[PDB]
């Protein structure tokens, strides 16, 4: 079988403070990213649905709120669901991270 991370798993991940700490996986959650081709010719495949001012159809014209607070016109390409992990640290703080920010233990 392929290795997997599951709820309750003791692992090592990055705290919001940037440092690594042992933590526990509280639950698996799916994050959905949107991909769009901007009118200016560039494209982003890591926007969140909250950045559009179900998902639109490929080619559909949409307005995207960028990181600069400005709105740009674009056409929707596709949505990308990605398996992610909600982990909780010693102080009780919690975070949703990707596979690459998680280091598993042998037991």
């Amino acid at each position: 079988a392929l290795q997997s991370i599951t709820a309750g798993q003791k692992v090592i991940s990055k705290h919001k403070n940037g440092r690594f700490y042992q933590c526990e996986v509280v639950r698996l959650t799916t994050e959905t990213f949107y991909e769009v081709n901007f009118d200016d010719g560039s494209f982003s495949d890591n926007l969140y649905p909250e950045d559009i001012v179900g998902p639109p159809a490929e080619g559909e014209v949409v307005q995207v709120r960028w990181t600069d607070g400005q709105v740009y016109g674009a056409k929707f390409v596709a949505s990308h669901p990605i398996q992610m992990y909600q982990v909780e640290f010693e102080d009780g703080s919690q975070l949703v991270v990707k596979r690459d920010d998680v280091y598993t233990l042998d037991e």
Partner: peptide, 7 residues
């Protein structure tokens, strides 16, 4: 991640 590019 909100990153853009022309590829």
């Amino acid at each position: 991640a909100r990153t853009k590019q022309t590829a």
